[PDB]
Design a protein around this nucleic acid. Structure first.
Ligand SMILES: Nc1ncnc2c1ncn2[C@@H]1O[C@H](COP(=O)(O)OP(=O)(O)O)[C@@H](O)[C@H]1O
Ligand code: BEF
Ligand SMILES: [Mg+2]
Lengths: 93, 107, 82, 576, 98, 95, 88, 107, 93
DNA sequence: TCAGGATGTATATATCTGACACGTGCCTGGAGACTAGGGAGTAATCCCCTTGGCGGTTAAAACGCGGGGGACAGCGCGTACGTGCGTTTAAGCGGTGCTAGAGCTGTCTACGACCAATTGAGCGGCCTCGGCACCGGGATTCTCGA
DNA sequence: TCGAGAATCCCGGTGCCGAGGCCGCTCAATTGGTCGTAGACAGCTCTAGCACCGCTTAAACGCACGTACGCGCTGTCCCCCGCGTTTTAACCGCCAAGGGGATTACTCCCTAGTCTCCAGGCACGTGTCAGATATATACATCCTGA
């Protein structure tokens, strides 16, 4: 049985922000439950937005509006900025 | 041709493919677009980068090079927006921000 | 094996320490029993939700995941345990 | 085709006459005429028109039939109602209970012609707070009176009372106010129980589009109330000009005349007198100011909502109607020299005013509401030409009081402000002369409605009308559409003008000559700053041309100019 | 005379001490026996993982800490430094928990 | 003249008796439009939407004054004060 | 004044001392301090901003210029306060 | 054979078929069992029957034969369990239960 | 466009409980939003229970446990009783 | 403690209407019938994590005992809010005029589901080694009685 | 305003168990192709939303005035804190039994899917009465004085 997690990814991002700082296993578990939490939130709001507008497909627009609903203020603005840049670079190349 | 990961195309460290799978099998909608895992993975990268940034700053302020749940409690609750997002969250081994009401102090 | 008077196992110094962390300076002598009642109610709720989850899965063991789904079920999200 | 309406609606005329209780004969079958007035009428002069109209409506009375008065204006609907009841029930003596309802703009007026033009018929009015009413319908609660004179909304609030008693003959005024049958007034007039005889008075028929010809002839008549949805395709006449005008216009409109002859009645002032001095209608044009004109392209470029129509009407009239603009122009908002130098309407206005007061002839002006009339008060107070003011929110006390303040010939005030909608029906004046209209008739029936308040029976002066419009603006396009509509009903109401006695040759006379008029404005479809041109309007004789040269040694001779930071800053604050 | 602190100083030093650390303030075995007793009334013969009991201890202690924070806000709003049961049940009445 | 506090109680019974809306339409609608101007310009509102905001707003303020009354009465005072309001909003977790 | 109006108090002031007074009478409040009014206006403005930003968000997502009742219902249910009778 | 509605088989007044459709197209799970719409429709019937019962009793107590939102507000809030379920609900045109704190009454 | 609702069904149940009592249209709308609300709650909890236990099919057991989670006390007991009786009679005949 | 008046509040009858209850034509979604297949039930085995017990240590809890400071009652002052009245004033209702965008349809096409082939990123098991817990001593700081 | 002294910070030293890197070993992520279809875009209709004014009147606003209550101050007493002493149950470390979670192999039958057929339910009307409103009349209650 292989149970996957986000551990190595939070580790990589941590080494990007603070290359000299490590993280304990418990804090890694907290980060994992955080990523799963926020993921289920944005996915749920995307499902609601897709159901109310009568569409069967989740696109970047529904995820964008969901981010603008969940994240207050600057988290929403910078989050939509980073995500839009990521989809931009993704489909451009 | 040599297969290149979609996470490397957009410049994301998070598994765009895994997020896409979770959106497909998560019973969210019947169909999933091609920009949803990229955009969502980017948002998660921003949030994780911020919370780990504040956690690293708190760890550096406490003279500890290893992040502990206390540094996550402080790093979150000291920030206004992350406190508004996580206000309903109970972090294990977090503790409480040091606080005393000014009326309780001697004079 | 009937268990009784175990809520009295919660000690006056314990609740006192919880209030010391909560920012309380001075405590009245009547806080204790009421705090025990409140804690018992909370545990009745969370434990009935978790035990409900465990009954639905036909399992005899209450996993930490069931407790996490009960707390998130009530609106209090607990990170770090899964 | 539809002549089943000819024979079947003539037999239906028999159905109203006997069964309810040439169209010149079978509909009018009960005949009479008398050129003598009823004995109750006192202090009035008898002309020919209200005779034929008098026993014409009496001919509608004896046959048990309704009707509409299609006449121009100034033919004394009040006279026909007074002499109507006083003659009819001078004979029969029943004399009541009878209902008459008029706009609140003129109420004590109608009682004033119920005062001097005849006694012996009492009146029940409704005005003011509920207390005076409590006195009135508390005294008359037992229902003894000759006539009730009321207004619109008091049958809506007092419909719980005055509709309990039985009525016979009602008089409702200004059918254009009636308009739609979907309006609450209409459907609540069925809550009014029943009055056998009816009538409607109007200075002009309904809107150019005319879907509501239904509503009209439903409230006017038993005729069409059975089938509501019928005529909407039969309205296609108004909406190969020879062939389309032929089939649509000539066919359908010949049908409309064929059916509608013995209902509407219209005449002119030249028919009864010829004392009408001129056609008494002109227009003018104006210019703009660059600091204001930038609002056209910039503020039209803003495209927040509904402004595009609202923005241009204001800025060509006043910049100061906008609060922020007036604040940024000057902080002090004191009376200033530049209040009238911002636009051209105030420049040419300051040009005409010395000649206005010079010639000794007065002027009527119509306005939009709210800030426009306020700023005009500020200008007329700035150069200090005294003025009355009138508008919708004023009470009836000073409504009638101000009406009396006009009637004094010694008046030192020439101009004054009056509301198109509120006061357009608000006065009856033989002594006025000049008229000005800014709003340019969102409905033409309102501009021609309030337009005739100048020329009147016994006018010893010569009327001139001015439409003040600025070039390169939406408002002259609104004038374009305005006389486009004047053509639209020009096939309807200008077709309805030759119908009085059901003549024959005059209809094609107005088709060839009037058709030359609509063709003339087909040419029309596709300055005056000097003293002489403006002198030409108000001259009307060489004598006035000579006496206005005394104003040429200052306005022209004069022993700055019209016209940036307000443009950029204005663009900043208006960009919200 | 033996040196004694003025009443209220030790309480503040304890406030700083316990607010400084992450330590759990309730002893394991009594809390576990309490959880088992409360769980007896639902389904008999249940098995608990250690991480589950630790979870109930985390949520319970954090909940009581927040409850004493709001209760302290009530007592201070009453111009008193001593929390009372009516402050507790007041906070639980305003939160909508009763 | 009535003793002070009787008219207040009669008003309590009166307004708690009926379902009537306690805020006038047009001012509340202009307020909603002003607040909405700062988000997206040139917006259209259905009447049922403004009525919805009026229902939720009035009910929210009624509950807020209930809890505020509980705070004032807990302070042994019959007069609610701003510190009671902001106290209730502090305990609810809204700030 | 009469020459130019200057009668504008804006809007949030359009919520009247008697209005808030009535809302307090319904809540069970007996006597009211003079400073409750400004705080109540502030709280009302806050709540209205919180709901309206969400309703306008749902409106912009559908690419519509009209804010309907369903958008407000989904904003209230979005913030945890459920509303009935207007649809859902 | 003549088609008989599944709502009539179990003796339910609610549209078992419609509930089944909403469970299929609601993106809840990938597959829906045969007892879910029947059981769920029955639960909804019990809840609706109870709330309409209390609403009818309140309407009868107020001498009105037509149920109004006020009768739903009273019928719910006067019941403990339905108040616990609907505690987060704001009912339009509901009003408030008449209440006065005993300390505020004169003496 | 035909927009379906629960109106006639709430009407039938009302005529079962109180045959002599009618209902206003607004109260019918409140009942409609109530039925939709509770429906979305039970269906959502059923989706969560089906996802946590790793099953792709919603059966009467998941709906039962969801009812026992959402409805406090006697509403849960009598609700499970009525529902179990309904499935019983359904599959029996 | 107890009677009299004025105000608001409840009751009885009449009346009048707009929303509610019922019938109707129709049509689209629900029921019946049939088929395939994959998910869930079920038997069997493995092991690891739970429960239980026992013994030795000791930090922590219970119990008591002074005493000082805070909860609480009482009292008095002053000022701030209820209450009523005359005066404005916009709210409410209506009615007009325009038109922007909600709402539906009809094509038509890029786009995502789905299956076969392939392989490298991530994971479980497995090794170091060092950042941090723990301790012992000293210097420093904050509290309390002169 | 100051020293005695108890608690705390700081610094140097030591031992360890979890963080961090490596290495097979998959199995899910990537690529390449199809195939049907959701929605993107253009077009058409027409409804409700926007502005504005007329007109009435219930509500808001400003103000005068009284007195109810918030708040400051004081005295009392009681009860909870700070500390010492004594007891006990938590804790840790170890050991042992075993049963319930976890997985895998086999099978079957419940539901998705499609086609066919028809009536349960829905928009649109029609009539019609529950109650909202108005008038008249009497009771409940507060406020006053006795
Ligand atoms: N014979 C007459 N002599 C003098 N004045 C007359 C005569 N007939 C009519 N008028 C004028 O006409 C006015 C009444 O006309 P009015 O009833 O307003 O007509 P309408 O109602 O058609 O507009 C009066 O003011 C009166 O001065
Ligand atoms: F005589 Be018109 F009606 F001015
Ligand atoms: Mg007239």
């Amino acid at each position: 049985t292989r149970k996957e997690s986000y551990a190595i990814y939070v580790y990589k991002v941590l080494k990007q922000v603070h290359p000299d700082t490590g993280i304990s296993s418990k804090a890694m578990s907290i980060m994992n439950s955080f990523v799963n939490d926020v993921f289920e939130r944005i996915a749920g709001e995307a499902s609601r937005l897709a159901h109310y507008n009568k569409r069967s497909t989740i696109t970047s627009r529904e995820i964008q509006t969901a981010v603008r609903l969940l994240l207050p203020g600057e988290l929403a603005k910078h989050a939509v900025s980073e995500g839009t840049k990521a989809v931009t670079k993704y489909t451009s190349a | 041709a040599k297969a290149k990961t979609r996470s490397s195309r957009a410049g994301l460290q998070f598994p765009v493919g895994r997020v896409h799978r979770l959106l497909r099998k998560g019973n969210y909608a019947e169909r999933v677009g091609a920009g949803a895992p990229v955009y969502l993975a980017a948002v998660l990268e921003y949030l994780t980068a911020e919370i780990l940034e504040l956690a690293g700053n708190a760890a550096r302020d406490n003279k500890k090079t290893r992040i502990i749940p206390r540094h996550l409690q402080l790093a979150v609750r000291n920030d206004e927006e992350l406190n508004k997002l996580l206000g309903r969250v109970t972090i294990a081994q977090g503790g409480v921000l040091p606080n005393i009401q000014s009326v309780l102090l001697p004079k | 094996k009937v268990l009784r008077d175990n809520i009295q196992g919660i000690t006056k110094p314990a609740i006192r320490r919880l209030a010391r962390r909560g920012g309380v300076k001075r405590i009245s002598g009547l806080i204790y029993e009421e705090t025990r009642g409140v804690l018992k109610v909370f545990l009745e709720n969370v434990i009935r939700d978790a035990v409900t989850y465990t009954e639905h899965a036909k399992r005899k063991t209450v996993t930490a995941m069931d407790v996490v789904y009960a707390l998130k079920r009530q609106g209090r999200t607990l990170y770090g345990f899964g | 085709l539809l002549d089943q309406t000819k024979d079947t609606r003539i037999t239906h005329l028999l159905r109203q006459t006997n069964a309810f209780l040439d169209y010149y004969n079978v509909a009018h079958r009960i005949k009479e005429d008398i050129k003598k007035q009823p004995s109750i009428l006192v202090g009035g002069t008898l002309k020919d028109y209200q005779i034929k109209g008098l026993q014409w409506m009496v001919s509608l009375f004896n046959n048990h039939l309704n009707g509409i008065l299609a006449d121009e204006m100034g033919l004394g609907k009040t006279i026909q109602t007074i002499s109507l009841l006083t003659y009819l029930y001078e004979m029969k003596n029943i004399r009541g209970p009878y209902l008459v309802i008029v706009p609140l703009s003129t109420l004590s007026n109608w009682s004033s012609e119920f005062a001097k033009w005849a006694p012996t018929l009492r009146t029940i009015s409704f005005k003011g707070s509920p207390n005076e009413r409590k006195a009135k319908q508390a005294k008359i609660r037992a229902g003894e009176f000759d006539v009730v004179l009321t207004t619109f909304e008091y049958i809506i609030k007092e419909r719980a009372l005055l509709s309990k008693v039985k009525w016979v003959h009602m008089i409702i005024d200004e059918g254009h106010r009636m308009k739609n049958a979907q309006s609450k007034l209409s459907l609540t007039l069925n809550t009014h129980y029943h009055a056998d005889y009816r009538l409607i008075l109007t200075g002009t028929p309904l809107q150019n589009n005319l879907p509501e010809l239904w509503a009209l002839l439903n409230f006017v008549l038993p005729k069409i109330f059975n089938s509501v949805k019928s005529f909407d395709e039969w309205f296609n006449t108004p909406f190969d000009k020879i062939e389309l005008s032929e089939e649509e216009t000539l066919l359908v409109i010949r049908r409309l005349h064929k059916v509608l002859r013995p209902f509407l009645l219209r005449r002119l002032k030249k028919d009864v007198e010829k004392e009408l001095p001129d056609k008494v209608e002109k227009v003018v044009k104006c210019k703009m100011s660059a600091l204001q004109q930038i609002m056209y392209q910039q503020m039209l470029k803003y495209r927040g909502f509904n402004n595009q129509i609202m923005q241009l009407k204001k800025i060509c009239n006043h910049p100061f109607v906008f609060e922020e603009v007036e604040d940024q122009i000057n902080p002090t908002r004191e009376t200033n020299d530049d209040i009238w130098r911002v636009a051209g309407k105030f420049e040419l206005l300051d040009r005409i005013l010395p000649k206005l007061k010079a010639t000794g002839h007065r002027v009527l002006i119509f306005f939009q509401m709210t800030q426009i009339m306020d700023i005009m008060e500020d200008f007329l107070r700035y150069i200090n030409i005294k003025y009355l003011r009138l508008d919708g929110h004023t009470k009836s006390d000073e409504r009638s009081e101000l009406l009396r303040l006009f009637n004094a010939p010694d008046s030192e005030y020439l101009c004054f402000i009056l509301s198109t909608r509120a006061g357009g029906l608000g006065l009856n004046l033989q002594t006025a002369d000049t008229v000005i209209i800014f709003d340019t008739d969102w409905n033409p029936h309102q501009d021609l409605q309030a337009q005739d308040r100048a020329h009147r029976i016994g006018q010893k002066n010569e009327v001139r009308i001015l439409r003040l419009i600025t070039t390169n603006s939406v408002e002259e396009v609104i004038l374009e559409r305005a006389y486009k509509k004047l053509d639209i009903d020009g096939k309807v109401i200008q077709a309805g003008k030759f119908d009085n006695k059901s003549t024959s040759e005059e209809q094609e006379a107005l088709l060839r000559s009037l058709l030359d008029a609509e063709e003339e404005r087909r040419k029309k479809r596709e300055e005056e700053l000097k003293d002489s041109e403006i002198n030409e309007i108000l001259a009307r004789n060489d004598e006035e041309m000579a006496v206005l040269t005394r104003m040429d040694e200052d306005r022209s001779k004069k022993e700055k100019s019209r016209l940036r930071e307000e443009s950029e800053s204005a663009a900043v604050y208006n960009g919200r | 005379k033996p040196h004694r602190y003025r009443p209220g100083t030790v309480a503040l030093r304890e406030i700083r001490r316990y607010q400084k650390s992450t330590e759990l303030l309730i002893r394991k075995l009594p809390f576990q026996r309490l959880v088992r007793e409360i769980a007896q009334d639902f389904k008999t013969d249940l098995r608990f993982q250690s991480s589950a009991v630790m979870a109930l201890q985390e949520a319970s202690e954090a909940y009581l800490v927040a409850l004493f924070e709001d209760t302290n806000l009530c007592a201070i709003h009453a111009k008193r430094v001593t929390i009372m049961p009516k402050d507790i049940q007041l906070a639980r009445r305003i939160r909508g928990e009763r």
